[PDB]
Design a binder for this molecule. Structure first.
Ligand SMILES: *CC(=O)Nc1ccc(NC(=O)C*)cc1
Length: 133
């Protein structure tokens, strides 16, 4: 009988995630959330688990909750944008990826070419969507 802290469950979820045990990692992050539900990173951790499993509605809800808790979160806007892109909500996806870019610059955070690459892909898939449909 030990009940772990939220941070311990987060670390446990990280190890499960690296092992590609995403349902188990998601459940770990969920148990961290119940212990401290005001911590936005636990929600973006779980949202990435759901994205790996193509659970878009759950990933969307976690990203939106992370933004309620931290409206300036680069990660929440980025994974929200990715989720929306996979759901083909192209204009919302691009707008959230642009917000992630602007916030990362404001916050002095280096993500290499991650955000420009996501933006370029999102725009190209949007245009391809239209050039066909
Ligand atoms: C704890 C840890 O290493 N997590 C982690 C998160 C994300 C990724 N990369 C992708 O999902 C593409 C690797 C490891």
């Amino acid at each position: 009988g030990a009940s772990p802290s939220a941070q311990e469950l987060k670390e446990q979820g990280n190890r499960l995630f690296v092992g590609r045990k995403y349902p188990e990692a998601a459940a770990c992050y969920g148990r961290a959330i119940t212990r401290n539900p005001l911590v936005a990173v636990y929600y973006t951790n779980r949202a990435l688990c759901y994205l790996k499993m193509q659970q878009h509605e759950q990933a969307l809800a976690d990203c939106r909750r992370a933004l309620e808790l931290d409206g300036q979160s680069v990660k929440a806007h980025f994974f929200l944008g990715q989720c929306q892109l996979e759901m083909e909500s192209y204009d919302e996806a691009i707008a959230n990826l642009q917000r992630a870019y602007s916030l990362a610059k404001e916050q002095r955070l280096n993500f290499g070419d991650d955000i420009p690459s996501a933006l370029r892909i999102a725009k190209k898939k949007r245009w391809n969507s239209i050039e066909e449909r």
